[PDB]
Ligand binder design. Structure first.
Ligand SMILES: O=C(O)[C@H](O)[C@@H](O)[C@H](O)[C@H](O)COP(=O)(O)O
Ligand SMILES: O=C(O)[C@H](O)[C@@H](O)[C@H](O)[C@H](O)COP(=O)(O)O
Lengths: 555, 555
């Protein structure tokens, strides 16, 4: 154990056990005209403003204080410093965790084993811009001799979600770039439906893989190459249509891609924190290197913000401690992410991986068995669509669900003189208001009175029209969703995730929970061949396998 | 509350911990050769097989019995009958709940107020086929004489998710049909990015809206019409490019649509159960009416299975009671849906709406305050992608998470001689095996011994490589994902949702938790105009609104 030993954690727990049930959001606001002023923070980045209103939360100044003492007591600051200074904090793998280095525009040296990392970081960044240029506008080589129209990124998990999410989110900066596609699933339908719309001679493939050994990626990659080599019969033309993002040059050249067309990153770059490195080649190819370097800066801005701001006003820290409050004290299993922005329709999913992959652990750094909750289940859907799909359970269900509502002040498409975005903003505002205020039995009763329902009817409907409210939310508004702000927003959460992991004393940059599936998978592959029944596994796995062999032939 | 007061419910609850012997999947399979045979059911639909393996669950024959007695004790069967017989079980709105009627291929009369519903159901179905055939054949032309290339459905929530999900899932049956798009969000970026790729004279718009008054839909509709009327200056040409699916003739005749271009459905058709009615026009337009009827037939099939199979072998019932077990006894907040199939990438989200908006209630039919958990938070992502994004927390996190793994035996794209689907199946099988088996401390150590780790390495690494397993899953395998099976699969869950709702004694066909947001929304819309600060709300809403007006025109 660890966290459960800490005194500040104990005090925070005892306080909740005793005064937690009385905390009312509706109450708080009427007895404190400054609640908003006291529980929010506006951030000027010089490239847009970011307001983080965390006032619609079940917290008092005393609560925020206990929460802050806890963050300090757990060594959040020292841990932060260890990360930025290049120390190997990813203990289990004895690696450094340096995604802040990939976006370190200041170029302040960061040393890993007596060698500053920035030179190799900028070396790669430069090479990306150089390649980007040659592709973006003619000049790059289609064995046929034509400029490349489509870029296909082939990768999974960390080598996929980030580039995809960011590219969908920054479409308004598509500007003269080629069309980018993203193939990840091993499921053959994925690459097949992508290759069906492509033209070999004008397509550029980017096999994105850190280890360059993942089964889904390499298989998808081999299928792309066989597809390409089908039209272009010369295996030497592969170097004109295939490039790679990885660390194992040996593996890369084995595939057929030459060493100079391999953009590299480093072991200290976690997969779920890789979009900022070479893995973001498709982003740069889509919105140009300027919009990319912009993305790189917004994070860097946040990186510095996180580093230099006292805890009481540190966004990532505040976001993280609020989560701990709801996770370790209230016991809430999930964290809802709701961006009222279509372009960000992949944002929530980006962080399911971001959060869950990092903090879905039960073993601390000392090897002690955790005896408290860790990472939450992160889910969500955008725009106003959720209001019609599942808000019903958020408002009147039986689960307490912390919600982060995000939205840009001005859209990329102010059509109809801004009427759409006006309605979008109103709902964004109204939902957290409703989630907080709710609607009492009397307010409801009074409404049914003015409706003309018979005492019979009114009673049978009254409680159903009652909103108990008191449902906590965070409102995150920013001037506009540009590459810089987006980069800032992503970094913000990355650090939220970091702070929680440090508080739980767990290694957020670990993915050991994935190897059991992979190995039992490799063991089953050959058993699927043939039609003889399998019996080596548990009855269920046997049954599933045999039902499969039986039905594989049916029509 | 008619549930916590139920005897069989209390027995089940006391049993859950009245004694140890605490369930452990690995132990139950180790000691019961008959587990798979005893806890699974294969369904032959004559149009493909559907195996539901629910053996990887924390349950014994005694548990399944107690769970079954409970379902009977809460009148699941009588409730079912009342639904099918057309009784107004949606009490709060005094409406019938008849989505089974929309797919009632047998045409067995269903009477609602002394009038059989089927005639009006088939009347509409026929009209859809008539319209569908005209647009696809090229008979229906824009007032330019050009055939129609793209179909744009404009709707939200129930008038959107179903058609979108099914259309993505049945792409292999696209066959000759137009390109179909789906605009829902009020967020202007959504329709704008869609209209930018369209050509007025060849585009057909389908304004899908039950009430035909929802703000997002009507606004998006008005924007489409203004966009169209931009190229085509004649307001009378609207009847050649706009059609409607509604129950509100008056408003439909107000927008500018033609009465005979209105395909109707009925108040007893819930929005989140509407894809089977006229709302599925875009599905029929995409895959033809034949496939559409195979879709309905599939559901009609599951309906009959639900209606005629004793509880002990009734899939929807077994799926529902397992959930109750994990929801009301173990206390699990979420239900994960994982389809190893790219085409079904919108499946989880569909039921995220179907489940959550149906059972996210806290008021029973008697008006009593629920004192037990209700509907779970439903989330999920497809293929093997999840294995790389969040399975880490499912395997080694601290949350118990019931998981439904779904997959077709044979794919629509057996490329590379079926190698991709082979790997896909192996992972599908291996994951539930791993989730069940896990890896003990000794097995793990025995691995680090083999690998040749140092006495230090193995030490600090041992715990982290341990999988405690015992994580329950359901495996749902089907011969192939065809319109019929898909239709069968959707119906199956619809009824699982029905059974749980009946057990909790709540009205699953209600959406009252929606109004508060809408009204507070309307109240804020006009306050956003102008630059004067708003002060009528709580400090937070005021702050958010004012930060907005402030940043509204910054550059
Ligand atoms: O880092 C992560 O979040 C996960 O480990 C995973 O998402 C990983 O990135 C890929 O499964 C492996 O792909 P690569 O071999 O390209 O790293
Ligand atoms: O059943 C539901 O889930 C709700 O009714 C919701 O999904 C509804 O479909 C939309 O809010 C649009 O409603 P209209 O179709 O009437 O415009």
């Amino acid at each position: 154990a660890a966290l459960t030993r800490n005194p500040q954690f104990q005090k925070l727990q005892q306080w909740h056990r005793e005064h937690g049930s009385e905390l009312n959001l509706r109450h708080l606001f009427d007895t404190d005209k400054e609640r908003f002023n006291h529980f929010s923070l506006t951030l000027n980045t010089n490239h847009g403003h970011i307001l983080l209103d965390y006032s619609k939360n079940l917290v008092t100044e005393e609560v925020m204080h206990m929460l802050l003492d806890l963050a300090k007591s757990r060594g959040v600051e020292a841990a932060r410093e260890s990360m930025f200074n290049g120390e190997k904090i990813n203990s289990t793998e004895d690696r450094a965790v340096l995604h802040v280095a990939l976006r370190n525009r200041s170029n302040t040296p960061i040393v890993v084993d007596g060698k500053d990392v920035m030179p190799e970081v900028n070396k790669v960044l430069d090479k990306m811009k150089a390649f980007c240029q040659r592709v973006r506008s003619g000049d790059w080589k289609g064995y046929t001799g034509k400029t490349i129209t489509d870029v296909i990124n082939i990768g999974i998990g960390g080598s996929d979600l980030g580039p995809l999410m960011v590219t969908e989110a920054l479409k308004p900066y598509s500007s003269g770039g080629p069309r980018v596609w993203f193939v990840s699933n091993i499921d053959g339908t994925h690459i097949a439906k992508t290759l069906a719309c492509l033209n070999p001679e004008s397509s550029l493939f980017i096999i994105a893989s850190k280890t360059f050994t993942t089964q889904e990626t390499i298989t998808n990659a081999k299928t792309a190459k066989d597809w390409f080599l089908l039209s272009a019969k010369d295996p030497s033309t592969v170097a004109k249509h295939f490039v790679a993002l990885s660390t194992n040059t040996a593996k890369v050249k084995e595939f057929g891609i030459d060493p100079q067309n391999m953009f590299e990153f480093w072991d200290w770059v976690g997969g779920r924190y890789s979009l900022w490195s070479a893995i973001g080649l498709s982003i740069a190819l889509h919105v140009g290197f300027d919009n990319f370097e912009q993305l790189l800066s917004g994070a860097h801005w946040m990186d510095q913000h996180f580093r230099t701001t006292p805890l009481e006003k540190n966004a990532p820290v505040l976001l993280a401690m609020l989560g701990i409050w709801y996770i370790n004290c209230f016991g809430c299993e999930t964290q809802a992410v709701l961006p009222y922005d279509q372009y960000l329709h992949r944002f929530a999913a980006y962080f399911q991986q971001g959060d869950m992959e990092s903090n879905g652990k039960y073993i601390t750094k000392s090897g002690a068995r955790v005896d408290h909750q860790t990472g939450p289940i992160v889910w969500g859907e955008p725009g106003t669509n959720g209001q019609h799909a599942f808000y019903q359970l958020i408002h009147q269900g039986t689960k307490m669900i912390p919600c982060d509502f995000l939205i840009p002040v001005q859209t990329q498409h102010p059509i109809r003189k801004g009427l759409h975005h006006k309605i979008l903003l109103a709902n964004f505002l109204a939902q957290t208001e409703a989630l907080m205020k709710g609607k009492s039995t009397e307010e409801a009763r009074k409404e049914l009175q003015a409706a003309g329902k018979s005492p019979e009817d009114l009673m049978k409907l009254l409680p159903h029209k009652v909103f108990e409210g008191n449902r906590p939310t965070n409102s995150i508004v920013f001037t506009k969703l540009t590459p810089f702000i987006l980069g800032a927003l992503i970094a913000m959460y990355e650090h939220k995730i970091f702070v929680q992991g440090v508080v739980w004393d767990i290694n957020s940059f670990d993915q050991w929970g994935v190897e059991l599936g992979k190995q039992l998978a490799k063991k089953i592959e050959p058993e699927l061949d043939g039609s003889s029944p399998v019996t080596s596994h548990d009855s269920s796995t046997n049954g599933l396998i045999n039902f499969i062999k039986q039905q594989r032939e049916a029509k």
